[PDB]
Amino acid sequence: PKDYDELLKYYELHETIGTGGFAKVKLACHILTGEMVAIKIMDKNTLGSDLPRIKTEIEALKNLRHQHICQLYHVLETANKIFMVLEYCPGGELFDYIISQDRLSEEETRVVFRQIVSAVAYVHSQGYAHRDLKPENLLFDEYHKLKLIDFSLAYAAPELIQGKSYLGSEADVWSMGILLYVLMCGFLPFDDDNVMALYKKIMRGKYDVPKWLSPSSILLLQQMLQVDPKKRISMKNLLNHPWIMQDYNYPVEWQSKNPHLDDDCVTELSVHHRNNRQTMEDLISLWQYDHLTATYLLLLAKKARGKPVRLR
Numbered sequence: 617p618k619d620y621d622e623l624l625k626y627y628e629l630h631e632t633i634g635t636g637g638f639a640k641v642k643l644a645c646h647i648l649t650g651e652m653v654a655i656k657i658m659d660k661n662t663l664g665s666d667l668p669r670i671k672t673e674i675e676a677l678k679n680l681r682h683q684h685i686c687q688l689y690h691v692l693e694t695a696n697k698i699f700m701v702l703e704y705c706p707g708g709e710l711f712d713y714i715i716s717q718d719r720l721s722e723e724e725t726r727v728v729f730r731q732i733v734s735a736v737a738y739v740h741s742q743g744y745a746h747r748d749l750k751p752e753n754l755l756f757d758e759y760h761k762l763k764l765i766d767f768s769l770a771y772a773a774p775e776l777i778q779g780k781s782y783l784g785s786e787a788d789v790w791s792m793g794i795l796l797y798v799l800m801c802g803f804l805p806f807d808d809d810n811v812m813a814l815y816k817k818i819m820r821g822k823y824d825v826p827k828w829l830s831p832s833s834i835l836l837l838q839q840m841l842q843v844d845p846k847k848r849i850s851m852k853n854l855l856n857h858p859w860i861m862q863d864y865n866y867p868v869e870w871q872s873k874n875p876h877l878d879d880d881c882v883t884e885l886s887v888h889h890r891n892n893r894q895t896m897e898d899l900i901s902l903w904q905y906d907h908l909t910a911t912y913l914l915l916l917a918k919k920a921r922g923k924p925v926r927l928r
């Protein structure tokens with residue numbers, strides 16, 4: 617209805633995949649590269665008074681450039697809509713994975729968990745928090761690598777639950793502790809059939825420790841699942857934790873391996889736009905999160921996954 621016209625120059629829309637909170641999520645294809653993307657759609661009239669909060673939050677997400685975070689490619693604002701185009705993760709949720717395998721071994725949990733820690737550390741290093749860590753918000757890519765999305769009650773920290781002020785970073789550590797327990801046990805540490813009983817169990821902080829957990833596992837859970845947020849392990853101490861280090865002998869590399877422009881991607885854009893190299897480089901370097909940014913980031917992802925850097 618005219619809000620979709622600009623978008624439909626660049627993307628072919630596939631199926632809705634998520635009628636989430638404030639935003640519809642559609643699957644789509646970027647025409648020029650033929651790459652699948654996820655498109656978050658919001659209506660500006662129903663955001664109303666929140667429209668500035670969101671526009672500002674969108675600017676924070678532009679800086680989230682990290683191998684274990686789903687990347688933002690394109691922001692398009694029309695008269696009535698905001699469209700956000702995001703990195704597609706075909707592998708589905710970690711939630712699905714844990715159900716299929718029942719529970720992960722300590723060794724496999726460790727591989728999974730270092731990736732989460734990696735991304736969460738990066739987020740906190742930029743002065744942000746995720747605030748909603750759970751297996752539904754962690755996706756696998758085609759190489760079985762984890763990507764964080766969506767910047768529930770079972771994973772929420774005691775202070776958050778009481779409606780007190782809370783530090784995002786501290787709440788993220790509690791939530792990762794619940795994630796850790798779920799990965800290794802195959803079930804929640806705190807569960808109940810009504811909200812009040814659940815809230816109470818979370819506040820009391822007592823949970824069962826299954827007899828298959830290693831002493832090292834038990835200890836790391838005890839450092840993360842501390843009802844008093846002050847008593848919780850710091851990010852610093854988590855990246856170099858003994859359990860984290862087991863079978864690896866180096867700490868979690870959390871800093872972004874993502875950049876300087878990639879010469880193959882620039883070449884292919886210069887060819888397509890019939891430009892000099894230096895002209896394309898200047899234009900890409902504006903980083904407007906327009907169609908050019910989108911195409912560039914999608915070629916950079918074809919490269920990163922070994923594919924050829926080509927436009928149609």
Ligand SMILES: CCNC(=O)C#Cc1ccc2c(c1)NC(=O)/C2=C(\Nc1ccc(CN(C)C)cc1)c1ccccc1
Nearest residue numbers: 633634641654677686688702703704705708765766767
């Ligand atoms: C900038 C920081 N990042 C963000 O804020 C973000 C994000 C975000 C959110 C969601 C997705 C994403 C990125 N990429 C994706 O591929 C997403 C979805 N993929 C997805 C859906 C269905 C199947 C199942 N198929 C078989 C239909 C697979 C895959 C997805 C959509 C809705 C719910 C769960 C996942």
